[PDB]
Amino acid sequence: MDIDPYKEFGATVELLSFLPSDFFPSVRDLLDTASALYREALESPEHCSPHHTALRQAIVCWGELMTLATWVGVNLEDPASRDLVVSYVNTNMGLKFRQLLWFHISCLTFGRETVIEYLVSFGVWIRTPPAYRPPNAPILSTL
Amino acid sequence: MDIDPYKEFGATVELLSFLPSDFFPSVRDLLDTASALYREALESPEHCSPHHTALRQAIVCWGELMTLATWVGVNLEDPASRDLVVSYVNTNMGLKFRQLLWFHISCLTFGRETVIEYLVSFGVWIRTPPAYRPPNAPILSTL
Amino acid sequence: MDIDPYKEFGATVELLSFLPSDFFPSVRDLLDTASALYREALESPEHCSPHHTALRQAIVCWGELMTLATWVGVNLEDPASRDLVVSYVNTNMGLKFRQLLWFHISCLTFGRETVIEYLVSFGVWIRTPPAYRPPNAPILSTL
Amino acid sequence: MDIDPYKEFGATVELLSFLPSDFFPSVRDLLDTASALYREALESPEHCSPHHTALRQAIVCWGELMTLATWVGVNLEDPASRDLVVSYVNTNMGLKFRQLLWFHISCLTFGRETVIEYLVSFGVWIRTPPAYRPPNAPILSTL
Ligand SMILES: COCCOCCOCCOc1ccc(C(C)(C)CC(C)(C)C)cc1
Ligand SMILES: COCCOCCOCCOc1ccc(C(C)(C)CC(C)(C)C)cc1
Ligand SMILES: COCCOCCOCCOc1ccc(C(C)(C)CC(C)(C)C)cc1
Ligand SMILES: COCCOCCOCCOc1ccc(C(C)(C)CC(C)(C)C)cc1
């Protein structure tokens, strides 16, 4: 239905299109970050924020995908296709899942405005060729 | 994190378990409804409601699952494994997807409170033995 | 029962597992620190702080564990079983003990809130990729 | 270091030595008493009292020792060593644990002052030879 999961929050798939894949932590790392920083709120009966809502939904999706992967490994007799499906799920879907988790966690942490500014600046940086861009990328940190 | 996607909305997997699985409409039907009634709001850059947020996330996840099914039908060779994966995706993941779509669309349309009352009333109905179970099952209506 | 030795201090086993196990100093190092810095207060007849109380209890428990290990070395004959017991103690219970000692000493020294923020920040740091995190690991300092 | 876990509260190991070792109720009984009277306070995120702070740590230590005992019963195939270790734990560590539990549960139920007066009076009673010792020993009570 031509839905962008970030347009509601002030971003776009094209704005995060520039962040490389090596930029995002692993799924386990991001899920641990969430479970340690906002678990009491995600497991809460309150609409603490749209970021919380989206995180809840995406975590449920990922749980269902892991269930799918287990079911595949248990019910498919062709190892080739089994590993192919599992690899597609992990690589692609987890890349998207990392994108979304990072966006929402970083927003909850720093600010939606700050994260969008960081995205703009990081796009400026990554579009520049290495011969003319500084070697050290921009950094979003609590320290 | 053990997250319930309805806890914030005032329900639970136990309160929706009152409804059978053969109750929820088709994914096609629910998506047509969602389009016809809230396309401009779901495509909007606004947190119109947590229901809208959750519904957007669910729809993007279903789109990714359809992409997975297509990628499977293309790449995978073993017809048994292809059909197994596609049928599992559709049946199970779409059962859950329709559950969620029904909940959120019905809420947006009638009321979260109305939908929870409908859940308890349908529980009463389905628990009533057939000898005394009226045929006029409960149904949501604006009239 | 379901007791967390950290919740009164505003932390959790989930938050202290958010840091690696190879990060926490040795039992000897932490006990030397505790002595040098708070021996007169831990050997005092005052509830100087809940940190002091918990640390006293932990140290007495570790002393009883050391007595157990010596008693094992003496009485037990099977060297395999003896070594296995002593190793279990000094590894598992040692890790737990030094996590707790680190928490409480670092709190007494820098601040409970400072230490919790440090846990969060160091976890996010060691989970973030190097090219996009600051290059130097976080550390607590009174200087 | 030389830490007495009672002088923080107003007692010593020499004062509680007035009571014999066969005086203290079993770990089962004392843990049931605690679960009955102060479960919600021990499981609370509050420094309700130093007695709570100490009892929490003691119970955590006891849980770790029980884990050790089960791990022993599993991984050790020398019944002699298994039994030796489990018996040592449940006897010596059990005695110390139930001393501490008695002290703290009593000081929570009655008070530091009442419990110390009780210790002194019971010392009188027990140092008194039996030919001149009343049968109605001192017995803590609110009635
Ligand atoms: C292979 O991925 C490359 C990066 O993605 C490019 C387009 O980005 C759009 C991302 O859109 C989504 C879609 C779905 C999702 C959810 C939360 C539903 C999770 C998923 C991918 C596990 C189904 C997240 C982001
Ligand atoms: C196989 O279904 C069993 C019945 O469902 C039990 C309910 O389980 C709770 C989780 O429900 C959902 C519902 C929807 C979803 C979304 C919207 C993310 C879509 C899905 C199922 C395509 C991943 C996820 C979990
Ligand atoms: C065999 O028992 C001797 C009785 O005399 C006790 C002398 O020592 C004082 C008791 O000190 C402790 C030490 C540790 C503990 C804790 C709470 C840590 C529990 C334990 C014994 C399970 C480790 C309690 C009391
Ligand atoms: C191998 O351990 C895995 C990591 O454990 C995570 C923490 O588990 C919760 C238990 O936490 C503690 C911490 C310290 C302690 C004390 C200080 C009482 C010491 C000990 C371990 C000797 C009993 C007890 C429990």
Residue numbers in the entry:
A (entry chain B), B (entry chain A), C (entry chain C), D (entry chain D): 1 to 143
Please give the exact wording used by the authors of the publication that reports this structure:
Intrigued by the changes in the rotamer conformation of Phe-97, we revisited the mutant HBc-F97L, which is a naturally occurring variant with an immature secretion phenotype. In an earlier study the side chain of Leu-97 was in the same position as Phe-97 in “conformation 2” of the TX100 bound state of wt HBc-CLPs. However, this earlier study also identified a pocket factor with an L-shaped EM-density similar to the hydrophobic head group of TX100. Thus, we suspected that this earlier map represents HBc-F97L in a TX100 bound state, which is plausible as TX100 was used during cell lysis.
The envelope with the surface proteins surrounds an icosahedral capsid that is formed by 240 copies of the core protein (HBc). The building block of the capsids are dimers of HBc, which consist of an N-terminal alpha-helical assembly domain and a largely unstructured C-terminal domain (CTD). While the ARD is projecting towards the capsid interior, the NTD forms the capsid shell with protruding dimeric spikes that contact the membranous envelope. Instead, most of the mutations with a secretion phenotype map to a hydrophobic pocket in the center of the spikes below the SS-bridge in the rigid part of the assembly domain.
